[PDB]
Write a protein that binds this ligand. Sequence first.
Ligand SMILES: CC(C)Oc1cc(-n2nc(C(C)(C)C)oc2=O)c(Cl)cc1Cl
Length: 276
Amino acid sequence: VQGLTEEQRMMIRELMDAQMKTFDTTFSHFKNFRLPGVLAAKWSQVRKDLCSLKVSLQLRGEDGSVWNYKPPADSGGKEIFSLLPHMADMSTYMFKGIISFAKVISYFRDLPIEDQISLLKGAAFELCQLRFNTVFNAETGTWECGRLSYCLEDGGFQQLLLEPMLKFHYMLKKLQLHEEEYVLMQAISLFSPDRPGVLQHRVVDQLQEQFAITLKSYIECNRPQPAHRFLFLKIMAMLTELRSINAQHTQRLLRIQDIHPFATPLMQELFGITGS
Ligand SMILES: CC(C)Oc1cc(-n2nc(C(C)(C)C)oc2=O)c(Cl)cc1Cl
C-alpha cells in the first residue's frame, strides 16, 4: 500500500496471512453438523430471545440437489429450539477458525497463555461476526456460506434493522471495506485490553493502538474519495457497537442455555460454563 511504514506493512501482511490460512471462505470443511428434525417468565424472555434471528437454511449438494428448511412459527412449544443444534455446530466451526487465526499471529502468541485465553473469550463472538459480514449478501439478506445459505425471513427491511445484530451487518456491509480493513477490525477487537481477566493490560493496549493507527493510515493512504471521509471513525464506532451486541448476545445465549442446554463443549469453554 501507499504511505505506510515498513512495520505497518508487515503488520497488515501478518494479519492477512493469518486470515488466509484460517478462514475457509467456502466452508468446505464444515461437515457432520446437526440439522433440524424432519416432520415461566424465563420462557417468555427466551421466546423473545430466539425470534430475534429468523433464518431459512439452504443446502446445495455437489450433485445439484437442493435441500431447503423453513423454520416454524412460535406457537408456545419447544419448536423454537429446532435450529439451535445446527447453529451451535456452525458457531463452533467458526470459533475454531477464529482461535486458529489468533494463534497464528505473532503479537498474540507472544502474550501469556492466560491473556491469550481471556482475549479469545472476550472477542471470539465479535471476530465470528466480522468474518460472517464478509459473506453477507445485503441485497438478498443472506449469509452465503459456500454450499450452505442462511436467508433472513420476510414490516420489511426497515423492521429487520431494529434487531441490533442485523442493523450491524447491513451498516458494516455498506462501508464496502477491503479485506485488509476487515482483518484490522478483527485485530482491534481481539487485542482489547479491557476484557475480563486480562493481566497485561498495558501491552495489549499498546498493541491495539498500533493496529488502530495502522488502520487509520491505511485508510488515509488508500481511500481519498469523499465517500470515505471519516471512515476510520465509522469503523471504530461499529467496533464499539459490536462489543455491545456481544454483551447482549452473551446474556441471550446464557438465558437460553439455562432452560434448554445446547452449547457445544467449545462454546461452554468460551462462555465460562463449567459443566457442573
Ligand atoms: C447458536 C447461537 C445461539 O449462538 C451463536 C450464533 C452464531 N452465529 N450467527 C450466525 C449468523 C448471524 C446466522 C451468520 O451464524 C452463527 O453461527 C455465532 Cl457466530 C456465535 C454464537 Cl455463540
